[PDB]
RNA sequence: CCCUCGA
């Protein structure tokens, strides 16, 4: 509903959304844009962020 | 086969991404290791594992790095 | 080329036509309403 | 990948970074003293902001964002005065029209963001269109005019190649490029002259390289005769080097074709040091292309008078048609209609006849710089029907050119078609920028999930069709449809063999396969049927068009899909 | 009238002929003054030796091909107008070549007269079979730059002389760029860049050196219109 | 010199059509079908013509000349746009000889609501009393305006009230002769009022004895900020002594030069790419 | 308190000072020390002075002041209102906006030396280079044609008339049968010079000072390259054309923030150069970032370059003392 | 042969210049050279700022003038000026009306000279007077007004634009034949501040010294 | 916001 709110017809799906007790579950890219998180793509995607950086023993010796 | 490259464009994007599976990865792989890099230099944790430019941004540090297949990265 | 106006700097004018009316006063429009 | 960036703006944007560096010299003793030095420019400032700005890059950005290339990522250049350097090769993305266009300027701060400029956004590293996959860092303008007037062959030119006869030796043959040059620095020798060439240092084309050199082909330094222009000589020296020998004048769609070639087969950096060099070139020639206008480089269709008047005999029997109550008042407009179509065709024949080809105006739209033979219709030979408010065409047409100039009658009737047009920009732009949004919005959480979702579900595309004779005809939308696909099943061709493997990107070569074996159509993996629940996998996306290799996971499609059909959008009537 | 910041001329050896030269800082606009007089002073001002005229024994009215030579007759031309020489006679000088029986003919085989260097004697000229003979003279001269071959014809020319054009100038290839170099507040100031590639007569130093003496001598000839004049020194 | 169609008693911008700001075949010698901006009022703001007047029933009207019997006299009559329909009206550009005779049989007029024909010259009721008739006084000012597309004549149009006044100014070598009434009408340039002789002069102002003995001085705006910032600066173009007449300009204005419109300089101009940067 | 006249005053310099009342709460803790140990008993003030907007300079004109303390008419609560005129030259320069009276504008791209500029065979520098390209598409030809009749007008002319009037020069008024060295004329509007007639004039073109003519009877002139010297191949189309100085210029446009003011109510940075705003961010541009699939600049312009309060000043805080960027917070216009 | 340089008089302030011979294709960028040093590196002296009685600024009137301040100061640009002094100078001018004060009225101090004594500067009536100061140094090219802040300069003195070039128009053509050679005419037209004769000799200095570079 | 203007 969040997502759909900031589309069109606002005062509609808010009103509709109130009435259904409805949860946004906040997985989307546009609410991440809202909320201000990392958005699901490209670098924000779980694989590339969480990435754990580590030199290489034969690099750290030198 | 290239001319000298300048500036962003050293190291060359074609063998950074020969080290990686993907852009992305590279960029949050370089990111992480540059903040490594300037966490060592102001707590005065590992240092640069190249010879470094007399000013050169961490980044850059970072970049030269991968292109060496100095360090290893886990994708999680 | 442009003669009704006194000290007016000479302009040759290529036009062919001769113009019977003069141009009314610009700001008539203001002025007369 | 660099942009000029004015000296107060970046004080202005880089202001903490100049304060902590020098704070860290003796400049300044403590970081508000920095402060203040920087608010007054003190002359201090400049060395330390040219170390603190090297390699830190910065986005540009020009509205309206019609597609994500309305932002790239640059390395800044301190550079004097006021206004904003921009790089001649991305007017394309941008659309920027230098009649006073405005870009922005942000600056990437954390780690994260600087690498992100560096790698995704930065210019050299998207020379393709995202859309289409062709080349839009390319030369335009004068660019284009510069190189084909470089690589044009001018029959009789000076200098050129002789034959030899009865006691007359063979003249115009040169030792190496050097000494065409040195020919051409005196007046012996044209640029655009044909001649025949000792050339150690290039690739000849393959036919050329089969059959004049052995297993190893063609190595530096081996020499082979060529015939050609010293202009093309130095053309293809801003190629590759190993890159075969293009005798050819270069039009735009030689230029793209090439430089397509280029990013297929090559590595992206040496596409983006190629199209530099191909863009000095371009400019250094395009000043001495001798390119210019003036009216008596306008020429005029000899017989327009006589055309139409026959046209207008036309008519006046149409007119005595009406008034003999024999036609419509319809059907009226439509005769005239017809019949001035007719003759404004026919003026732009005897128009395009009355040209020779190295004509300024004639030059510079056969090359594909700019413009069409319209406007040089319009120009020179007629104007023709207008369009009425409502958008019915007059059936009285306008028959002087804007070289002859229009009555005022003739002035006042376009203007009706020039102004509504004018407003129907307006609102096109508007209308396709809502549909973008919409489109944007249904998209948006497309993304690419997964690597392979495996699912043998295919669309089977044309990919050529046979005619009654054995040859088979090339279907025009290949392209598109095609192309850039990954394989869902292996091609059998009606005999036993397997072209092509499941899972191949369908490129050129991988098409010219399909198409020498003889198969008309193929079963592609799509996103209409990829089994992926949420979003896609890459393999059914198949090639990134930008990169040209198969999509990254993490990709948005959803955006680029919706912005690659939007962005356009400005252009449909 | 000032004296500005003193410009520097580096040079890095890309080859043993080859080499960049950089001039830097320039006041704003001097990379144009220099850079195309520079190019072409290196270009034409610089005196070299060169063939002008061969004889080939066995080719007089029509120059196709040479009976027993693989080579005709005007990659022949192509292989000696590559020749590198020479000469300190200031005048004409005619020099021999005569191999028979099967073989390559390099300029190597070339017998020199006193006075001329023949600096690339590996060069391959021809080849012959075992019927084939190669007689052929050359005239090398002494001049500048590069003369075509209808400037080679003699009025007087004897039959048989082929007239070739003649690369005297040492140098074979000359480019020059300016970009622009940062002095204090100022991003606007030229650097000159000059790519030159020159035969193994001469080095590239040796010819920037060369080409530096006769242009001050010609500018000289302003400067001693008044040698009170007052002008930029720096 | 605007007509405004928005405002209180007008229509919203929001309810105005693409119908709205169309040209319209009775807008000939009334509005400008050149001069309008070209962002969103496009067609909603529009430059009453040169010759038009406002009568005063709030209707625009322009003249014309009689044409009795295929002659065309120096009588002129102002018509209102009902008025215009029932007549003939003959485009300025069509030939005349000495005579009043027209040179052609037939001739393209306006006749019946805004349709273009080729016509008897036998019947016609008026003709236009010159070009730029139809055109407002920024676009009568684009010399050589009929060899350009209407869509860059807007453009130019709107361009020449973006010029900034200069601190010299310049007249152009090549003019429409309109520049020399534009500037006076406008009032930015002194003009004097009455004949007479320049009795004292200088920067600050110019003094000027009528032959009655009365005499009349004008001060000289001097460095005054114009509402955009521009500098409104009036010079004294008359020396003492001088012999003036009644409607003579005795001083310039910000972009007036010897009493003529300079909105700009006569500059060297090469056609050609140079280099890139022209790019 | 109030700037001389006749001064030359640079961003950043006080035009006129004024002090506002300030609250104890306000004061910092160290400034609340120094003041009691040091028996200041003056009021606590903040400085309101009037002081130059960025990217300005001039010289004070003018000076107008009205007090209350007079019987100057003011607004309610107001007691002194003071103006101050600053007069500014502008020179031409990069990024100003020239045009055409034909439509044709551009930005200057480029000053050059007059050194390196084209010049024709007497030494004469051309003042303008316009791209030929541009020309022929935009469908105004009349640039061109003012240009060949602004060049007949800088030399003059004499059309031939010995052998009598030439067929092209019979509609010709007798009074433009020749002309002096920059003659002013008129080419009024759908009444004007024709294409033969202007033609015509081209060949009788004036010499110059030593006899020679420059522009051939196209309208064109061979002209030699600044920069080499080497003449250019073809003869380029030259002539005089009048062009004029818009009011879009790089001094008022050219405009750059780092940190500055913000909005009270959504917590984000003002904007126009007036206020020393930022620039918007807007949903399209968001898109391309999404697109090029960067979460992180665009998180960065989204928290803690715009709309996070602890974020903006911890950001500021690590680039002064060198360290890295802190992880963003909440945007304020969420919780809005 | 070596090549030669001969002087052809035309005017008191033109010259022409013959170089020959000199190999072909030489001549272009060797008159071009000369005529970039010209037109940008040539000495001379301008004046730098000027001090008027009763005006701090330079928008604004003198009583009795007809010229403002601006106008004036324009016109006091097309003032040609020969300093030997080599250090700021000060030259006065002082009128009193009715009359036109041209560039003789200037009073020059020892060591420069005006070369354009009627130049207009400015009308004045019975009312009119006129009190000015001229700053004269010595330099090249062109200048802009230095600020006041630059220097440490009151409110009174009034900086203005430095035109120190004494050369007008430069340009050349070649005569393309010994065997094969170009012939060199180098077009010289300074103002009356110095002779086409040393404008070229001080060009030859700067050249001479410059291409030493390459050694 | 509105007026007016730039791409
Ligand atoms: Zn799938």
New interface residues.
């Given amino acids: 509903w969040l997502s759909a709110a900031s589309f069109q017809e606002t005062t509609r799906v808010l009103t509709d959304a109130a009435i259904n007790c409805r949860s946004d579950k906040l997985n989307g890219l546009k609410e991440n844009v809202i909320i201000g998180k990392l958005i699901p793509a490209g670098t924000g995607i779980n694989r590339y962020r969480n990435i754990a950086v580590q030199p290489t023993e034969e690099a750290r010796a030198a | 086969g290239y001319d000298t490259p300048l500036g962003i464009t050293n190291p060359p994007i074609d063998e950074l991404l020969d080290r990686v599976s993907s852009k992305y990865a590279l960029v949050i792989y370089a990111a992480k290791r540059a903040r490594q890099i300037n966490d060592y230099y102001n707590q005065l944790y590992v240092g640069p594992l190249v010879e470094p430019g007399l000013q050169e941004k961490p980044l850059s540090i970072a970049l030269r790095e991968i292109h060496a297949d100095l360090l290893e990265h886990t994708e999680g | 080329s442009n003669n009704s106006v006194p000290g007016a700097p000479n302009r040759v004018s290529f036009a062919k036509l001769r113009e019977p009316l003069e141009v009314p006063g610009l700001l008539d429009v203001q002025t007369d309403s | 990948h660099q942009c000029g960036l004015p000296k107060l703006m970046a004080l202005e944007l880089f202001k903490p970074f100049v304060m902590k560096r020098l704070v860290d010299l003796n400049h300044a003793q403590n970081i508000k003293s920095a402060k203040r030095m920087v608010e007054r420019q003190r002359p201090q400032v400049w060395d330390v902001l040219e170390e603190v700005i090297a390699e830190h890059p910065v986005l540009l950005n020009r509205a309206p964002t019609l597609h994500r290339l309305g932002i790239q990522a640059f390395e800044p250049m301190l550079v004097e005065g006021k206004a904003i350097q921009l790089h001649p090769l991305v007017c394309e993305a941008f659309n920027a029209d230098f009649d006073g266009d405005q870009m922005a300027v942000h600056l990437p701060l954390s780690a994260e963001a600087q690498a992100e400029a560096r790698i995704l956004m930065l210019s050299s590293n998207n020379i393709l269109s995202p859309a289409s996959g062709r080349p839009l860092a390319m030369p335009r303008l004068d660019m284009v005019t510069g190189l084909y007037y470089l690589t044009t062959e001018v029959p009789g030119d000076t200098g050129e190649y002789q034959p030899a006869s009865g006691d007359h030796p063979e003249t115009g043959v040169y030792s190496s490029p050097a000494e065409a040059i040195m020919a051409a620095d005196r007046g012996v020798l044209s640029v655009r002259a044909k001649i025949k060439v000792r050339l150690t240092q290039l690739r000849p084309p393959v036919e050329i390289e089969a059959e004049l050199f052995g297993h190893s082909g063609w190595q530096p330094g081996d020499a082979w005769m060529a015939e050609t222009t010293l202009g093309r000589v130095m053309f293809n020296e801003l190629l590759p080097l190993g890159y075969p020998f293009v005798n050819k004048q270069m039009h735009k769609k030689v230029q793209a074709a090439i430089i397509n070639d280029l990013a297929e087969r090559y590595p992206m950096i040496v596409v983006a040091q190629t199209v530099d060099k191909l863009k000095d070139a371009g400019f250094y020639w395009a000043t001495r292309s001798g390119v210019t206008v003036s009216m008596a480089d306008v020429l005029v269709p000899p017989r327009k008078k006589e055309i139409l008047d026959h046209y207008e005999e036309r008519a006046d029997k149409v007119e005595k048609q009406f008034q003999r109550g024999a036609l419509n008042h319809d059907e009226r407009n439509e005769a005239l209609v017809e019949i001035w179509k007719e003759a404004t065709d026919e003026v732009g024949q005897a128009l395009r006849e009355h040209y020779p080809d190295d004509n300024p105006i004639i030059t510079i739209v056969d090359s594909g710089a700019t413009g069409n033979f319209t406007q040089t219709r319009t120009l020179a030979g007629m104007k023709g029907l207008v369009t009425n408010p409502k958008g019915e065409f007059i059936p009285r047409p306008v028959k002087s050119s804007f070289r002859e100039g229009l009555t005022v009658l003739e002035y006042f009737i376009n203007t009706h078609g020039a102004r509504k047009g004018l407003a129907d920009t307006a609102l096109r732009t508007a209308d396709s920028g809502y549909l973008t949004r919409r489109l944007v919005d249904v998209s948006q959480d497309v993304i690419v999930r997964e690597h392979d979702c495996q699912t043998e579900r295919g669309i089977v595309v044309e990919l050529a069709e046979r005619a009654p004779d054995g040859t088979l005809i090339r279907d025009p939308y290949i392209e598109t449809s095609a192309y850039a696909r990954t394989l869902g099943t292996d091609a059998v061709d009606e005999a036993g063999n397997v072209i092509v493997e499941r899972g191949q990107d369908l490129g050129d070569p991988e098409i010219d396969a399909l198409l020498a074996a003889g198969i008309t159509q193929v079963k592609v993996r799509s996103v209409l049927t990829c089994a992926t629940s949420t979003g896609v996998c890459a393999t059914c996306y198949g090639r990134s068009m930008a990169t040209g290799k198969l999509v990254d996971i993490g990709e948005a499609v959803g955006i680029v899909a919706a912005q690659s059909i939007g962005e356009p959008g400005t252009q449909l009537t | 009238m000032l004296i500005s910041q003193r410009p520097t001329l580096s040079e890095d050896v890309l080859t043993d002929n080859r080499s960049q030269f950089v001039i830097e800082p320039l006041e704003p606009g001097f990379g144009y003054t220099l850079g195309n007089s520079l190019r072409r002073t290196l270009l034409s001002s610089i005196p070299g030796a060169a063939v002008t005229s061969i004889r080939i024994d066995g080719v007089l009215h029509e120059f196709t091909t040479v009976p027993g030579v693989k080579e005709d007759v005007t990659e022949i031309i192509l292989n000696l107008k590559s020749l590198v020489v020479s000469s300190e006679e200031d005048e004409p000088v005619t020099m021999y070549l005569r191999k028979q029986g099967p073989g390559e003919v390099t300029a190597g085989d070339i017998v020199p007269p006193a006075g001329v260097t023949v600096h690339n004697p590996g060069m391959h000229i021809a080849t012959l079979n075992d019927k084939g003979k190669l007689e052929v003279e050359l005239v090398v001269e002494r001049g500048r730059g590069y003369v075509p071959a209808v400037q080679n014809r003699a009025s007087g020319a004897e039959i048989g002389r082929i007239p070739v054009d003649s690369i005297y100038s040492p140098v074979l290839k000359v480019t020059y760029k300016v970009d622009a170099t940062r002095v204090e507040q100022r991003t606007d100031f030229d650097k000159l860049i000059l790519d030159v590639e020159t035969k193994n007569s001469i080095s590239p130093r040796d010819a920037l050196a060369s080409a530096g003496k006769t242009l001050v001598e010609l500018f000289g000839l302003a400067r001693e219109l008044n040698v009170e004049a007052e002008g930029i020194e720096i | 010199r605007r007509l405004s169609a928005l405002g209180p008693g007008g229509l919203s911008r929001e309810r105005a059509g693409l119908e709205v700001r169309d040209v319209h075949p009775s807008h000939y010698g009334r509005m400008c079908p050149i001069e309008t901006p070209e962002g969103p009022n496009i067609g909603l703001i529009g430059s009453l013509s040169v010759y038009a007047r406002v009568n005063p029933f709030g209707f625009i009207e322009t003249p014309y000349r009689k044409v009795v019997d295929g002659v065309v006299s120096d009588e002129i009559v102002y018509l209102t746009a009902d008025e215009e329909d029932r007549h003939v009206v003959a485009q300025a550009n069509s030939p005349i000889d000495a005579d009043g005779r027209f040179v052609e049989p037939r001739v393209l007029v306006r006749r019946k609501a805004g349709e273009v024909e080729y016509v008897p010259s036998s019947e016609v009721d008026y003709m236009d009393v010159s070009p730029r008739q139809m055109v407002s006084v920024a676009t009568a000012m684009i010399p050589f305006l009929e060899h350009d597309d209407a869509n860059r004549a807007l453009m130019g149009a709107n361009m020449q009230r973006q010029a900034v006044p200069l601190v010299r100014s310049e007249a152009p070598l090549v003019g429409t002769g309109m520049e020399l009434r534009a500037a006076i009408d406008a009032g930015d340039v002194v003009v004097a009022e009455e004949s007479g002789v320049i009795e004292e002069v200088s920067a600050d102002y110019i003094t000027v004895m009528h032959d009655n003995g009365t005499r009349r001085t004008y001060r000289m705006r001097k460095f005054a900020r114009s509402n955009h910032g521009t500098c409104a600066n009036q010079c004294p173009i008359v020396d003492a002594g001088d012999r003036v007449e009644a409607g003579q300009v005795i001083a310039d204005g910000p972009c007036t030069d010897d009493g003529e419109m300079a909105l700009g300089k006569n500059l060297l101009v090469a056609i050609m790419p140079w280099e890139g940067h022209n790019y | 308190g109030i700037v001389?006249?006749?001064?030359?005053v640079?961003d950043?310099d006080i035009l006129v000072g004024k002090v506002t009342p300030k609250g104890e709460t306000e004061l910092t803790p160290e400034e609340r020390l120094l003041r009691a140990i040091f028996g200041e008993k003056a009021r606590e003030v903040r400085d309101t002075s009037l002081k130059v907007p960025?990217?300005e300079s001039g010289?004070?004109?003018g000076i107008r002041v009205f007090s209350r303390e007079d019987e100057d008419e003011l607004p309610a609560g107001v007691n002194e209102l003071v103006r101050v005129?600053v007069?500014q030259?502008r020179?031409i320069?990069?990024?100003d906006?020239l045009?055409?009276?034909?439509?044709?504008?551009?930005?200057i791209?480029?000053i050059?030396?007059?050194?390196?500029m084209?010049?024709l065979?007497?030494?004469?520098?051309?003042?303008?280079?316009?791209?030929?390209?541009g020309?022929?598409?935009?469908?105004?030809?009349?640039?061109?044609?003012?240009?060949?009749?602004?060049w007949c007008?800088?030399s003059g002319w004499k059309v031939d008339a010995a052998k009598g009037v030439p067929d092209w020069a019979a509609?010709?008024?007798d009074?433009?049968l020749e002309?002096q060295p920059?003659?002013?004329?008129?080419?009024?509007?759908?009444?004007?010079?024709?294409?033969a007639?202007?033609?015509g004039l081209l060949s009788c073109t004036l010499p110059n000072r030593d006899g020679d003519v420059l522009v051939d009877?196209?309208?064109?002139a061979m002209?030699?390259?600044?920069?080499?010297?080497?003449?250019?191949?073809?003869?380029?189309?030259?002539?005089?054309?009048?062009?004029?100085?818009?009011?879009?210029?790089?001094?008022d446009?050219?405009h750059?923030?780092?940190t500055g003011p913000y909005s009270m109510i959504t917590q984000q940075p003002l904007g126009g150069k007036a206020q020393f705003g930022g620039?918007r961010?807007?949903?399209?541009?968001?898109?391309?970032?999404?697109?090029?699939?960067?979460?992180?600049?665009?998180?960065?312009?989204?928290?803690?370059?715009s709309?996070?309060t602890v974020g903006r000043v911890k950001?500021?805080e690590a680039?002064?003392?060198?360290?890295?960027?802190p992880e963003?917070?909440?945007?304020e216009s969420?919780k809005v």
């Avoid at chain 7, 050059?112 to 390196?116: A, C, Q």
């Avoid at chain 7, 105004?140 to 044609?145: A, E, R, V």
Wanted: aromatic fraction near 8%; hydrophobic fraction near 35%; proline fraction near 6%.
């Fill in positions: 001389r006249i006749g001064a030359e640079r950043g960025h990217g010289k004070v004109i005129y007069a030259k020179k320069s990069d990024g906006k045009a055409g009276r034909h439509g044709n504008k551009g930005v791209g480029k050059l030396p007059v050194e390196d084209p010049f065979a007497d030494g004469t520098p051309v003042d303008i280079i316009l791209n030929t390209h020309v022929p598409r935009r469908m105004n030809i009349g640039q061109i044609l003012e240009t060949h009749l602004g007008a800088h509609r010709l008024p009074e433009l002309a920059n003659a002013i004329v008129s080419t009024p509007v759908f009444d004007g010079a024709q294409e007639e202007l033609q009877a196209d309208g064109k002209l030699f390259d600044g920069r080499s010297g080497e003449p250019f191949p073809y003869p380029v189309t030259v002539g005089y054309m009048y062009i004029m100085k818009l009011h879009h210029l790089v001094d446009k050219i750059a923030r780092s620039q961010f807007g949903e399209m541009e968001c898109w391309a970032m999404q697109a090029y699939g960067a979460a992180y600049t665009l998180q960065e312009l989204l928290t803690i370059k709309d996070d950001v500021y680039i002064v003392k060198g360290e890295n960027i963003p917070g909440i945007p969420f």
